[PDB]
């Protein structure tokens, strides 16, 4: 919850769509989720499994990342 | 064509922020990223790690990915 009795949520705003929202298409159809449920849902799981277990020799990786996530031709 | 207008990232918009921003924060401090390139960085990381290779055995862990993703109960 992180409130009280319902989970909070604030709308949040973000600039992509071309590769996401394509992209969401497998994992919402894969997922049956929604484009929100599958980057809400893959958002927290990425820092669980980097954060919970960031090791050390991940961490420049870090960079390849968010570096690698927008790949150009 | 209508590239960029067309073909391009678009202000996408997705209701979180208590667990997502939270979460964001521990990333956003670890990664230095800001939650929108956290959010964005792990969303194409997620299927690039996990969707390039979805399994059919992973399917249920799916769910974990779910359930986990809030770590409460």
């Not at 954060?51 to 990786?61: A, I, V, Y």
């Amino acid at each position: 919850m992180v409130e009280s009795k319902k989970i909070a949520k604030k709308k949040t705003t973000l600039a992509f769509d071309e590769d996401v929202y394509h992209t969401l298409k497998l994992v919402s159809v894969y997922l049956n989720r929604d484009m929100t449920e599958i980057i809400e849902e893959a958002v927290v799981m990425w820092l669980i499994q980097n954060k919970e277990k960031l090791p050390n020799e991940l961490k420049p990786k870090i960079d390849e990342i968010s570096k690698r996530f927008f790949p150009a031709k």
